[PDB]
Amino acid sequence: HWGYGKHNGPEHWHKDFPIAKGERQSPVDIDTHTAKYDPSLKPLSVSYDQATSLRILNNGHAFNVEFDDSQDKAVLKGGPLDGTYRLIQFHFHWGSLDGQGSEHTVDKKKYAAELHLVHWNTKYGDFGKAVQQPDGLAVLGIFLKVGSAKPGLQKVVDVLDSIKTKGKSADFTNFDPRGLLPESLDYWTYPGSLTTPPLLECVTWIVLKEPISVSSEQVLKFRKLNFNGEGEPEELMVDNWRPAQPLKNRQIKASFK
Numbered sequence: 001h002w003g004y005g006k007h008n009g010p011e012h013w014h015k016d017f018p019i020a021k022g023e024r025q026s027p028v029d030i031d032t033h034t035a036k037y038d039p040s041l042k043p044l045s046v047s048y049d050q051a052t053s054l055r056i057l058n059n060g061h062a063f064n065v066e067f068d069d070s071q072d073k074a075v076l077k078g079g080p081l082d083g084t085y086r087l088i089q090f091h092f093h094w095g096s097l098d099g100q101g102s103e104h105t106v107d108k109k110k111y112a113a114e115l116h117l118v119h120w121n122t123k124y125g126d127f128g129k130a131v132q133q134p135d136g137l138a139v140l141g142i143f144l145k146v147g148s149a150k151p152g153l154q155k156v157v158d159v160l161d162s163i164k165t166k167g168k169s170a171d172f173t174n175f176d177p178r179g180l181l182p183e184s185l186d187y188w189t190y191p192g193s194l195t196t197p198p199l200l201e202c203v204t205w206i207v208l209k210e211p212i213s214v215s216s217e218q219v220l221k222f223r224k225l226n227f228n229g230e231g232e233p234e235e236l237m238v239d240n241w242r243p244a245q246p247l248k249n250r251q252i253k254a255s256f257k
């Protein structure tokens, strides 16, 4: 089944998921000189004050922090978006070393990791119906660089020892995702896809320009997770990123001059 190894990683995914070679795949390199400021972009709105986190899960690829999405409680609106998108989960992608780990790149620069806050368009009623639509999802992407610790990340770091292996989960109520955001909401946006199988082309990507800083110790704890299940030989969960894909017929727009 799919993964990030030499035998089942990004170069193999197209055999089971032919849209891997599609017209609107993610991630991409963001060429900052080619991106164009778009004055049509409405102000972006991240409204997370009522977020209700539930659980953290090691799914064998990354770890997901899941939210209650039964009601408009944590939502993304504005920017390139029409309507309202509800937060369902966040997760990260990261490297074995600090010089790689992000999925998107900025003028070919790779960051140490990348946070994805995944949201679905409430006009489609459920996440499963949203992923049958070209405007079903919005993913807010945030780069991580190593420097000072991110206080709002530490509760995530500290629970990882309890979800070391694939299939393990833990309660993760009362987590505030506002603590993962940088100061600025300046962003780039383009139409793309999920970056893991099934690679569905449903996503409006919103990638923040400002990275957050996390400490070396925080990212080192990500790298102690395991891809494998309990009782199986240890496979460190590192380098769970897809590289940049062809831009094809797309324009990346900037929210900032």
Ligand SMILES: N/C(=N\S(N)(=O)=O)N1CCCC1
Pocket: 116, 117, 118, 139, 193, 194, 195, 196, 197, 198
């Ligand atoms: N790959 C994904 N999100 S991402 N990496 O495109 O943000 N997902 C797969 C199922 C739900 C979200």
Ligand SMILES: [Zn+2]
Pocket: 091, 092, 093, 116, 195
């Ligand atoms: Zn992701």
